[PDB]
C-alpha cells in the first residue's frame, strides 16, 4: 500500500504539499518544507520586485478557516530563482516555483528566465491566475479575455510544461468557459483548484470589528468554509480536462479530506489554512490518515479511486 | 424587548424571516411560518406554471451547512397568489412573495397581476434574481446585462417598490458593477444577500458517492459554509446602495450571527439552513439571543448598530 505518484515527469512520495503562500516565503520557510514529509513543496508566488505586502494584521484564522489580505509580500523573483537554481536539494523531493506578476509582461519576464533552470533542475511553474490586473476590472481568472492573453503570452515565453492555479468558479457556464480556455493550452499539464474563496468578510461580535486591516477586513477565505466549493472545481475541471492533471487545494485538514479531494479527481492534495495553522507535523499525521482510509477500503494505490467519485442514478 | 421595526411602510415584529424556499412552499408551510414567532415570511420562489423540481435526493445537510439542487419545484404561481390574496393573514405579519420565472417575459406575467394585490394587500416583492437564464449563459445576476434587462422590464411592468434577490459575489469590480445596476432602479428598494454559494460538491467518503442526485451532486451551499461570504456581500451592497434596504442571509444560526448580518447593514435577517434543520421554534431563540447581546452591549435599539461594523485603523 503507498502513496507514491509518478507525474509530470518527477517521483513523488506523496501527494501532500503546502497551497502557495503558506510557509513558503523565506529561505527558512523552504528548507522546512523540504525537511518535512510532504511530496513536494510550493515557493510563495512572487513578483519582479520584492514586496511587503499590505499592512497587518492580514491573516486571521479561526475554527472553521481563514481569512487573509496578504497582499502579495515576498522576496522577488531573484530569490525564488536563486533558491530553484543553487539551494533546493531535488534529491529530497520536488520544488513547483509560483509566479504572480501584477501585468501579463510581468509574467513574461519572471518564465523567460526560468526556463533555463525549469530545463536544467526541473523546477515546476504554477502560474497565478487567481491574482489582480487592472484595478477596477476582476481577477485574471475572472477576465476570460484576459486570461487567455496570459496563457498566450505565458506559453511563447516559458515554452515548457507548466500549470495554473484557479480562483473558484460558482456558475456551470464558468466551469465550461474556464475549462475550454485552458484547454487550448497545450503546455498546461496541470490545474490547482483552488485558489481562497474572495472577498469574504469575517466579524468579531465582541470588538464588533472586522478581524484584517487591508481592504476594510475583506479577504480571501481558506479552511473549512471552502471544502465543498474547492471538491466541486477539482471535479468539474477534472471531468472537463481530461489531458490535463488536477491538484486539490482548498479545506483539506485531514486524511479524510484528502480522500474526498482524491476521489473528485485531485493528484497532488495542497494544504494551506491547516498547515499555517498546525504546522508541518501535520503532513505524517496526513499520511497516516489517508493510508488507514484506504486500509479500511482495500486500496493499494491512489488510481485505484483517483476521480472515481459515484453519483447517483 | 422589544425588537419592531417599520420598513417599506410595514411593521415588523422582528427582523427575522425565513429565507425563500425554506418551509414556504405549501400552504401548511406557509401557515406554518405565520404562526411562528418570525417577523416576516417570504414564499417560495415561484413559476407560472407548478413545478415538480428535480430528482431526490436534491437537499442534504450537515454540521457545517447544506446542498441543496431543488430545482424550483413549487405549487404555481397562482397558489401564491391565492394565498397572497385571499388565505394570508396581513394582521400576523408582512408577507413577502418570490418570484422566480424562467425568463424575463415570465417575470413580467406574474408581476403585471400581483400588482393589484400588492396595492390591496401590502403583499411584497422578491425577485429572484438567481432565476436561470438562458442554458449556457451564466444565472443572470452573473450577466450584468441580462439583469439590467431584467429590472427594466420588471420595474416598468410591477411600477412599485420590491427588492431582488442576489448570489454572491466574490471580486470587488463585480461588487461595484452589480451595486451599478442596482441603481438604476429607483423602485428595488430592498437587496437580499444571499443565495446559496453556487455549485458546491458534498462527498460521503464512506460511501464514495456525491449525496444530491441532480446535476453530478453539484448544488447550491447554504449554513455555516457560507457566513463570512454572507456578510461580506451584506456590507459590499449596504456600503454601496445608501438608498436601498439590504436583507442578511446566510449562515444564520444564532442570535450572534444575526448581530453580524445587522453590523454589517442587515435591516431584516432571513434563516434558510438552520431553519430547515430546527425548525420554525428557531424563531424564539433567535430572538431571545439578539435581546441578550444588546442587552449585554447596551444596545436598545438596531438602528444603533445596524450597519456600524468596525475597520481597522
Ligand atoms: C496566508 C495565505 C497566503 C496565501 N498566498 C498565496 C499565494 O501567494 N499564491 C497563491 O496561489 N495562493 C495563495 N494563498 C491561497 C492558498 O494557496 C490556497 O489556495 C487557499 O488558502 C485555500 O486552501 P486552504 O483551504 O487549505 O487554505 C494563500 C492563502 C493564505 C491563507
Ligand atoms: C432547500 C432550499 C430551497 C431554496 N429555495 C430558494 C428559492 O426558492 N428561492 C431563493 O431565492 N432562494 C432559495 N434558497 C436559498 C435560501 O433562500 C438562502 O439564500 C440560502 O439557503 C442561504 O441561506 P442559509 O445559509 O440560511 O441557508 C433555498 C435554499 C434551500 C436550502
Ligand atoms: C487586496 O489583495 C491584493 C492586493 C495586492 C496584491 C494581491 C495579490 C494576490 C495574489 C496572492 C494571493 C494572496 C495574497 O498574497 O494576498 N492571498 C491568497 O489567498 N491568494 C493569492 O493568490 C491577492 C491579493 C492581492
Ligand atoms: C439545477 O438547478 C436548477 C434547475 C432548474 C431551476 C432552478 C431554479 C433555481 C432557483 C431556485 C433556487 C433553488 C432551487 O429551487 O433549487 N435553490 C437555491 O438554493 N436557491 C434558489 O434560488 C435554482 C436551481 C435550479
Redo the contacts with the bound molecule.
Keep these: 500500500m503507498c502513496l507514491k505518484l509518478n507525474l509530470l515527469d518527477h517521483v513523488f512520495a506523496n501527494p501532500f504539499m503546502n497551497a502557495?503562500?503558506v510557509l513558503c516565503s523565506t529561505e527558512e520557510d523552504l528548507r522546512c518544507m523540504t525537511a518535512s514529509s510532504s511530496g513536494a513543496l510550493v515557493s510563495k508566488?512572487c513578483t519582479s520586485a520584492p514586496?511587503d505586502?499590505?499592512p497587518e494584521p492580514?491573516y486571521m484564522a479561526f475554527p472553521l478557516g481563514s481569512i487573509?489580505?496578504?497582499?502579495?509580500?515576498?522576496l522577488g523573483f531573484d530569490f525564488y530563482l536563486k533558491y530553484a537554481s543553487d539551494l533546493h536539494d531535488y534529491s529530497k523531493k520536488p520544488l513547483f516555483l509560483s509566479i504572480?506578476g501584477?501585468s501579463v509582461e510581468e509574467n513574461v519576464a519572471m518564465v523567460r528566465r526560468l526556463a533555463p533552470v525549469a530545463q536544467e533542475k526541473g523546477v515546476l511553474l504554477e502560474l497565478?491566475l487567481?491574482?489582480?490586473n487592472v484595478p477596477g476590472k476582476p481577477?485574471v481568472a475572472y477576465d476570460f479575455e484576459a486570461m487567455r492573453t496570459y496563457l498566450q503570452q505565458v506559453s511563447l515565453a516559458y515554452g515548457l510544461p507548466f500549470g495554473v492555479?484557479m480562483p473558484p468558479y460558482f456558475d456551470i457556464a464558468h466551469f465550461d468557459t474556464a475549462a475550454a480556455v485552458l484547454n487550448e493550452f497545450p503546455l498546461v499539464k496541470f490545474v490547482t483548484c483552488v485558489?481562497?474563496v474572495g472577498n469574504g468578510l469575517v466579524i468579531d461580535a465582541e470588538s464588533e470589528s472586522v478581524v484584517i486591516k487591508?481592504?476594510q477586513g475583506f479577504?480571501?477565505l481558506?479552511g473549512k468554509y471552502i471544502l465543498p466549493t474547492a471538491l466541486a472545481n477539482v471535479n468539474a475541471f477534472y471531468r472537463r480536462c481530461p489531458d490535463k492533471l488536477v491538484f486539490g487545494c482548498g479545506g483539506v485538514y485531514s486524511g479524510e479530506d484528502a480522500f474526498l479531494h482524491i476521489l473528485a479527481g485531485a493528484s497532488m492534495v495542497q494544504v494551506?489554512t491547516a498547515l499555517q495553522e498546525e504546522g508541518p507535523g501535520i503532513f505524517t499525521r496526513l499520511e497516516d490518515e489517508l493510508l488507514e482510509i484506504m486500509a479500511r477500503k482495500g486500496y493499494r494505490t491512489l488510481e485505484e479511486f483517483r476521480g472515481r467519485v459515484k453519483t447517483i442514478e
Design positions: 502557495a503562500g508566488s514586496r505586502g499590505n492580514r487573509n489580505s496578504m497582499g502579495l509580500p515576498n504572480s501584477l497565478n487567481s491574482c489582480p481577477q492555479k485558489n481562497s487591508p481592504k479577504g480571501g481558506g494551506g
